[model samples]
Target: GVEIETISPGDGRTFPKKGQTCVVHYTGMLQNGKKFDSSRDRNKPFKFRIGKQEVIKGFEEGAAQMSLGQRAKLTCTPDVAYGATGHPGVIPPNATLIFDVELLNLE
Candidate 1:
């Protein structure tokens, strides 16, 4: 069986690379620690590149700060994560998200 191990960036080291694209597997939770988003249900890793319109701002920031095999925890504020418009029924406006992500690989 696989046990879930949690790790933090610890005041954290920022990688500082503007990823043209990043591929990752992640799980997103609220500050209350409720799980909200995950890649498993989709059976595929979620991916995005810098300036890709499909993702939230903090996500692009995170990818820019990642390295292959790096694991990161992204604490996203409403303005950076989902903004005021959110996902309508799925997410309320001005919501924040915390993501536990793995930079599984890259191109």
Candidate 2:
């Protein structure tokens, strides 16, 4: 399961639903506080469909819990992230991931 801590709350108007598309900006790091990837660094927002498995389980699950314009820190255990077979060249085995994420839009 993902542990979510709010950095800032959203407008409280609406939240993304399954099958909807979501746009987000995120910076990914390891438990040691080493950054591995960031949408902000690329100056681009990442988009994906909710419940489509297009992204990691924790990421998608965390994003789905957010409302538009929300910002949060999501801590993902390996079971919900890259798991035992972590992503090669980036994440190590059984690595825990942390993400500073902002939900920008839902469509």
Tell me how many clashing residue pairs each candidate has. 0, 0
Candidate 2 achieves a global lDDT of 0.83
**lDDT, each prediction:** 0.67, 0.83
lDDT of 1 by residue, 8-94 (tens): 433334343455566788888877647878986797887666665577777776666666676777877787756678886777777
Worst 10 residues of 2 by lDDT: 7-16
**lDDT of the structure predicted as candidate 1:** 0.67
lDDT of 1 at 3: 19
What shift in Å separates residue 63 of candidate 1 from its native position after superposition?
Answer: 1.0
The C-alpha RMSD in Å for every predicted model, in order, reads 6.5, 1.2
Give residue 7's lDDT in candidate 1 (0 to 100).
63
Candidate number achieving the greatest lDDT relative to the actual structure: 2
Q: TM-score for each prediction?
A: 0.73, 0.92
